[PDB]
UniProtKB/Swiss-Prot annotation, chain A:
Function: This protein is located at the 30S-50S ribosomal subunit interface and may play a role in the structure and function of the aminoacyl-tRNA binding site.
Organism: Mycoplasma pneumoniae (strain ATCC 29342 / M129 / Subtype 1) (Mycoplasmoides pneumoniae)
Protein's gene: rplS
GO CC terms, sorted: cytosolic large ribosomal subunit
Keywords: Ribonucleoprotein, Ribosomal protein
Protein family according to the UniProt entry: Belongs to the bacterial ribosomal protein bL19 family.
Protein name: Large ribosomal subunit protein bL19
Cited InterPro entries: Ribosomal_bL19 (IPR001857), Ribosomal_bL19_CS (IPR018257), Ribosomal_bL19_sf (IPR038657), Translation_prot_SH3-like_sf (IPR008991)
Record-annotated disulphide pairs: none
From Swiss-Prot, chain B:
InterPro entries per the UniProt record, alphabetical: Ribosomal_bL17 (IPR000456), Ribosomal_bL17_CS (IPR047859), Ribosomal_bL17_sf (IPR036373)
Family: Belongs to the bacterial ribosomal protein bL17 family.
GO MF annotation: an example: structural constituent of ribosome
Cysteines engaged in disulfide bonds, as pairs: none
Any one Gene Ontology BP term: translation
Keyword Transferase recorded: no
Keywords (A to Z) from UniProt: Ribonucleoprotein, Ribosomal protein
Subunit structure, as described in the record: Part of the 50S ribosomal subunit. Contacts protein L32.
Pfam families referenced in this protein's UniProt entry, alphabetically: Ribosomal_L17 (PF01196)
Tree of life domain: Bacteria
GO cellular component: cytosolic large ribosomal subunit
Organism expressing this protein natively: Mycoplasma pneumoniae (strain ATCC 29342 / M129 / Subtype 1) (Mycoplasmoides pneumoniae)
Name of this protein: Large ribosomal subunit protein bL17
Phylogenetic placement of the source organism: Bacteria, Bacillati, Mycoplasmatota, Mycoplasmoidales, Mycoplasmoidaceae
Curated annotation (Swiss-Prot), chain D:
Region described as Disordered: 1-20
Sorted UniProt keywords: Ribonucleoprotein, Ribosomal protein
Family of this protein: Belongs to the bacterial ribosomal protein bL32 family.
GO process terms (BP): translation
Name of this chain's protein: Large ribosomal subunit protein bL32
UniProt biased composition (Basic residues): 6-17
Recorded GO CC terms: large ribosomal subunit
GO terms of molecular function: structural constituent of ribosome
Curated annotation (Swiss-Prot), chain E:
Subunit structure: Part of the 50S ribosomal subunit. Forms a cluster with proteins L14 and L19.
Functional summary from the UniProt entry: One of the primary rRNA binding proteins, it binds directly near the 3'-end of the 23S rRNA, where it nucleates assembly of the 50S subunit.
Family designation: Belongs to the universal ribosomal protein uL3 family.
Membrane spanning residue stretches: none
One cellular component term from this protein's GO annotations in UniProt: cytosolic large ribosomal subunit
Protein name as catalogued: Large ribosomal subunit protein uL3
GO molecular function, one term: rRNA binding
Keywords: Ribonucleoprotein, Ribosomal protein, RNA-binding, rRNA-binding
Gene Ontology BP term (one): translation
Ranges in a coiled coil: none
Residues of the full protein shown: 1 to 229 of 287
RNA sequence: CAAGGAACUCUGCAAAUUAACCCCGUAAGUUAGCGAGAAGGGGUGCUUAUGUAAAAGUAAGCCGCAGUGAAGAACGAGGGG
RNA sequence: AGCGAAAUUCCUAGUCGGGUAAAUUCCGUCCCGCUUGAAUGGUGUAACCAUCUCUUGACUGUCUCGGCUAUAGACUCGGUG
RNA sequence: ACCUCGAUGUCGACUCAUCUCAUCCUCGAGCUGAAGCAGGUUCGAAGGGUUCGGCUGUUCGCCGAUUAAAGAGAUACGUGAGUUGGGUUCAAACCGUCGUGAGACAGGUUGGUCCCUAUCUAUUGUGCCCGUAGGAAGAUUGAAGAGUGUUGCUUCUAGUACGAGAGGACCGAAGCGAGGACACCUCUUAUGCUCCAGUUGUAGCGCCAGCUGCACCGCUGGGUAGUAACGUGUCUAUUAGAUAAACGCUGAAAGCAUCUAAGUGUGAAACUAUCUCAAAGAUUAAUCUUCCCAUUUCGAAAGUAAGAGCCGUCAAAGACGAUGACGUUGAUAGGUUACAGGUGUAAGCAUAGUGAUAUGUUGAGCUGAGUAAUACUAAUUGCUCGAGGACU
């Protein structure tokens, strides 16, 4: 008959999270992960700075960059994912929407907090 | 083959658009090729719609496009636009111009088209 | 994607500072090793007080990759430098201690020893 | 790459079968009489009952 | 066998999260209820099939022989008619919806007219390889290889029928099998299929019961959220 | 043009990196002239004040992912005929 | 004398050591030099080379492996031909 | 020494493969100096698959590390009107050696121009005309065909059978992969020249600020739609028939024995189908449904109230044609309006500051193609072709 392609958006309202805190590119958040090997789901926390916050619906994704023992790891999670929970700790100052320059910025390269 | 003309680079297309919109606002009619007319029309419409509010931001945004012609200079053409052309169209939602097809040219059998604008 | 002839850092205590992929193992034309694939490697730099001298051909298990790989859950784990640990013939590392983090995707293939000695798994 | 054998007067005529021209569509402008090719403006400068040009 | 089929229009693609801790890409297919327009019986017409009419349209935008066929057969006018072989368990003049045909999580296959990719060359078309570019390898270095089969009258002296050279690619029918169905939406008359479906966003998409795994179903649930604040 | 970085190949052919100015520092060998721009590194933008006669410089401050912000400027080491 | 598998060595892809995961090419070395050799010069030699030959850091679409974009053609229309 | 010297381009590599079986692997069976595992050989089988690298001009080869395996061959020792020129082999030069000498040597070495706009056929695609005996629209069957077919590792069966003991399965089920193919772009990535921001220089808009051209798009950081993969889904199953090798049950000729002569079976990746695709130009021209039409006054010429074409607006299509949507009774493109996504706090104003500039208005302004409404502009008050079913 006729289509809107707000149907794509409609079917995605079946699973969208309620709160989903808002955080721009350069923010320091802790993203707690549920893990289930056999039973007794363990919560591995994974704190770090954010790089990118792309997304257009149920597919909002974001990058978190952590440093362990001088070794950096960037991990990309899907925001509207059961089995992930996100808390915001610090909100940083930034001029860009995808701070790719942090791939080559070592220690003593930290965003100034925002007032 | 090797040495070749610069050709229709993107700058050439955009600069042709600017010259033709300047010419159509200045006089009110253009006799060009059809497939440049359909491409000039879009920018023409966007300018005339952006020019109905008259704040200085709109003057800046339109200054980015116009060029001076034999009839009007650019700072005269801006006043001529915002005084009589833009307000005349202030109530029409879209449809600020028409492109009608003339006869084929003798030189190239291209499809000459006339671009104009009336209420 | 660690490819044939790809020098990748070593993340254990065997003194093998630089090690070059020599033949990605596992079937014909594997031509790419992702997380957990066992490769065969050759040391090209070492330290004098080390259990591997320069030139020996050994086997390695890759732990860190720069390209990373899309996990099933949708999280996409990406590192910044390629690392490998040196295994001896069943699953067991030649090194006493592992440096830096290690990706979990070794857990199901085996190498429960390599995950245990790691500082912290991701 | 050259022909090995001359293409006769028969093969050449057959190829040109698809070369024939088309008679272009013709309409009769109202507001005057003449055969302007359809969907154009005639030399009146009138297209339909609207004026878009000069006398000729 | 008892092949079941339905038609729709592919509206786009997205993803949805399930139990078993898995992300599942999805195609969304708008399925207006169809209408059987003819049934072919084995004895009468030498085979069996069911003819389905769909994409309802106004009677004006329809050719006269077709609208006459619809008025005589007591149907709603439809832009499209096509038929499915070996659909048997249905009668005449009935509305068919996807909910009445397919289980919640079972296996279907999808046919759709693919994406027209233009006149494309051999190396993109047949996955051929590209002649080296270094060491000055001469300007025809994007070709179909040597088409040789034999030089001299004894050997082959021609090109083989059904060679692999450049030509038209896309806008041809293809089918992906064993793609499970995730869920439905009766409100929008809409269905969710796993995997990626051929064809552009908005084409016509046929779903049949998969021949490889006819009745096989393995249920897959969803992943209702429990994080609110 | 991601990851890799010479595996293609007859050969790193071609293509790529460095690139001006200013300040450190610069081996083996030798006809003691050179080697040597050796190797290897750092700084560069705008504002204020100080700068001398102009300027380079100096201290403080400010922005950006990056400051000869574009263009035009050496790739190098080791052994052999 | 010197030097020596050489721009010279057929058997010869000589042997041995180094490089190398692996080395008919490469560096050094022994000498039955088939036929090296002293102004048709011998042996060394710093600098120099749009010369040759080998190893290597950085470096890169050379390559696993192929993709995308923009122009001029190509293709279509009118004209010459 | 039979065609070819009024020219049939020659080694090796690259690309593309194609075919044969005397089989390397995968598959089925026998015999064993076969306990098990792993083998040795023979029989059938050509559906598919059959590595990457160092050295060398290389084939060949030696060597490393893999793999289930790294087959032997043919096709002008396939393939230069496809590519390369490293080698052989032009002139230059040199060492060894021969010759008195000019020069020579399948002895060595350094360097050294590879032309062609395809007419026929072949082939890949895509069309025009016509036919299919009324004319048009749709839906079909499928004769004759095309494409795909590879395989491992782990766990259980079970440390069971076997064997003294190390060691250790057939048959069968499940899971994760490698290579190859078909699509797609939700996620990750590359691009993405009328997108967004920063930014140097000079020249212009009279000046400041703010903008424009120009410099690889001027450079750099992001990037919508599209397009692809390194990405994500699916496939590479399974079942049936007739079979080769082998095995048979009954069973004689040849009173026993005997798988065959009659009768009756088991059986493989091969074969014919199952699966994917295309297909009535299959002139042997098929089938179904719907629609429209019967005259003229002497074979004509009249030639549909069904439809198709020209013409215009176009993209889900696109080299041009063709396919497909729409043509005022309309949402086909453009524009406008609202929005998404992308960029990332505009210009101007006020405060602090001597000043670059920071802070508030401000998650602001902007935005090619994206999503959807909206007749304002453009799709015209047109043209042509075309029915009477000829006889048994
Ligand atoms: K000859
Ligand atoms: Mg001849
Ligand atoms: Mg022609
Ligand atoms: Mg040439
Ligand atoms: Mg022409
Ligand atoms: Mg040529
Ligand atoms: Zn007229």
């Amino acid at each position: 008959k006729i289509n809107k392609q707000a149907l794509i958006d409609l079917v995605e309202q079946k699973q969208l999270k309620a709160y989903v805190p808002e955080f721009s590119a350069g923010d320091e958040v802790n993203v707690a992960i549920k893990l289930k090997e056999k039973e007794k789901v363990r919560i591995q926390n994974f704190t770090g700075t954010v790089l990118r916050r792309r997304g257009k619906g149920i597919s909002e994704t974001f990058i978190v960059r952590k440093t362990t023992d001088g070794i950096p790891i960037e991990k990309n999670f899907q925001i509207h994912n059961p089995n992930i929970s996100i808390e915001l700790k610090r909100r940083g100052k930034v001029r860009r929407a995808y701070i790719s320059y942090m791939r080559e910025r070592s220690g003593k390269a930290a965003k100034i907090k925002e007032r | 083959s090797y040495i070749n003309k610069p050709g229709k680079t993107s700058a050439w297309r955009v600069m042709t658009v600017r010259q033709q919109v300047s010419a159509v606002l200045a006089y009110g009619k253009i006799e060009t090729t059809l497939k440049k007319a359909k491409n000039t029309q879009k920018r023409l419409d966007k300018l005339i719609t952006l020019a109905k509010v008259d704040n200085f931001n709109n003057r800046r945004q339109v200054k980015k496009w116009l060029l001076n012609t034999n009839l009007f200079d650019v700072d005269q053409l801006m006043d001529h636009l915002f005084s009589k052309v833009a307000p005349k169209y202030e109530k029409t939602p879209g449809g600020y111009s028409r492109v009608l097809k003339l006869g084929p040219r003798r030189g190239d059998a291209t499809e000459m088209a006339i671009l104009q604008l009336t209420d | 994607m660690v490819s044939f002839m790809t020098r990748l850092n070593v993340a254990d205590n065997t003194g093998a500072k630089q090690v070059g992929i020599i033949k990605v193992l596992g079937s014909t034309r594997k031509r790419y090793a992702f997380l957990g694939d066992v490769v065969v490697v050759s040391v090209k730099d070492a330290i004098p007080s080390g259990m591997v001298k320069k030139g020996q051909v050994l086997r390695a298990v890759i732990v860190r990759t720069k390209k990373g790989q899309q996990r099933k859950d949708g999280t996409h784990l990406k590192f910044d430098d390629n690392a490998c640990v040196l295994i001896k013939e069943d699953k067991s590392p030649r090194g006493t201690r592992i440096f830096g983090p290690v990706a979990r995707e070794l857990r199901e293939r085996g190498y429960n020893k390599i995950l245990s000695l790691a500082v912290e798994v991701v | 790459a050259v022909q090995q054998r001359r293409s006769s007067k028969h093969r050449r005529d057959k190829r040109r079968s698809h070369d024939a021209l088309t008679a272009q569509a013709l309409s009769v402008c109202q507001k005057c009489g003449k055969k302007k090719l359809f969907h154009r403006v005639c030399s009146c400068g009138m297209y339909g009952d609207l004026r878009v040009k000069k006398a000729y | 066998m008892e092949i079941r089929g339905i038609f729709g229009v592919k509206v786009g693609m997205s993803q949805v999260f399930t139990t078993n801790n898995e992300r599942l890409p999805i195609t969304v297919i708008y399925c207006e209820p169809n209408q059987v327009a003819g049934v072919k019986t084995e004895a009468k017409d030498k085979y069996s099939a069911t003819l389905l009419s769909f994409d309802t349209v106004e009677n004006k935008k329809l050719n006269k022989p077709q609208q006459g066929f619809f008025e005589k057969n007591n149907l709603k006018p439809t832009k499209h008619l096509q038929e499915i072989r070996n659909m048997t368990g249905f009668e005449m003049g009935q509305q068919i919806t996807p909910q009445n045909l397919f289980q919640v999580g079972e296996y279907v296959d999808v046919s759709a007219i693919s994406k027209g990719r233009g006149f494309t060359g051999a190396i993109k078309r047949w996955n051929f390889k590209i002649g080296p570019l270094g060491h000055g390898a001469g300007y025809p270095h994007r070709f179909q290889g040597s088409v040789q089969a034999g030089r001299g009258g004894a050997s082959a002296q021609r090109v083989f029928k059904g060679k692999k050279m450049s030509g038209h690619y896309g806008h041809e029918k293809v089918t992906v099998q064993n793609l499970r169905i995730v869920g439905f939406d009766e409100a929008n008359m809409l269905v969710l299929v796993s995997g990626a479906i051929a064809g552009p966003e908005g084409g016509v998409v046929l779903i049949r019961t998969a021949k490889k795994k006819p009745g096989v179903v393995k249920p897959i649930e969803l992943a209702v959220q429990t994080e609110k604040a």
